């Protein structure tokens, strides 16, 4: 029981850390993808709002 308890702690921490790192990488990646692609859509919304 002590063996599987410590194995649970070690594996859960080692997997959750990679999940946090993949989350930070995915957020930074989608922001840098969206930022350079911008200013095409502002003309679309500004054309469709105005009469």
């Amino acid at each position: 029981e002590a063996q599987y308890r410590e194995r649970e702690r070690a594996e859960t921490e080692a997997l959750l850390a990679r999940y946090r790192e993949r989350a930070e990488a995915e957020a930074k990646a989608v922001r840098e993808k969206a930022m350079a692609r911008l200013d095409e859509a502002v003309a679309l919304v500004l054309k469709e709002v105005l009469p």
Partner: protein
């Protein structure tokens, strides 16, 4: 005497039957205690392994 040795042999046969029954019952007791140590070592190991697996599933879902 003859019936003297017959009665002594009957006492030896009673002691022999007593010790054989003691061996048989002690073997049965240690056997069933071995199966209960066994199958309990089965049950708690499978339960703790399944707990570890369910913890991993919940962690990857989270």
């Amino acid at each position: 005497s003859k019936l003297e040795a017959i009665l002594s042999q009957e006492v030896e046969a009673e002691i022999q039957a007593l010790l054989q029954e003691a061996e048989a019952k002690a073997e049965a007791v240690k056997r069933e205690a071995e199966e209960k140590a066994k199958a309990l070592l089965q049950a708690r190991e499978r339960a703790l392994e399944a707990q570890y697996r369910a913890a991993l599933r919940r962690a990857e879902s989270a």
